[PDB]
Symmetry: D2
Subunit: 33 residues, 4 copies
Amino acid sequence: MKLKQVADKLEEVASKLYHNANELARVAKLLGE
Amino acid sequence: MKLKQVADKLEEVASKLYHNANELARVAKLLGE
Amino acid sequence: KLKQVADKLEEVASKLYHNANELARVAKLLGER
Amino acid sequence: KLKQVADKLEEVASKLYHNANELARVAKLLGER
Ligand SMILES: [Zn+2]
Ligand SMILES: [Zn+2]
């Protein structure tokens, strides 16, 4: 695959990981309270 | 073990995910170039 | 509430594993260049 | 170099494999808590 298609895949993985970080941060806040 | 210590671990995992999300965004930029 | 929390973490864990597989596949392809 | 990017993607994949297992471990802890 061209580098552009690679970049496209990585940006979708990046936003999924960011979403999952927010999910864990929210759970962590719950548990720490 | 304390529940706060679990919450702390989840905070750390979330940190790795925020960091990885940024790293992938950066790499995607690099490849877009 | 710990049972629902456990279930959420398992959901996220599966998602991270799947994303790891995806990145490894992408890494293989870029390394073959 | 595309080799350096590939190596970095393999490393981010490792972080994700590791996090996935950590979350599964924490989920188990919470389930028996
Ligand atoms: Zn970094
Ligand atoms: Zn660990």
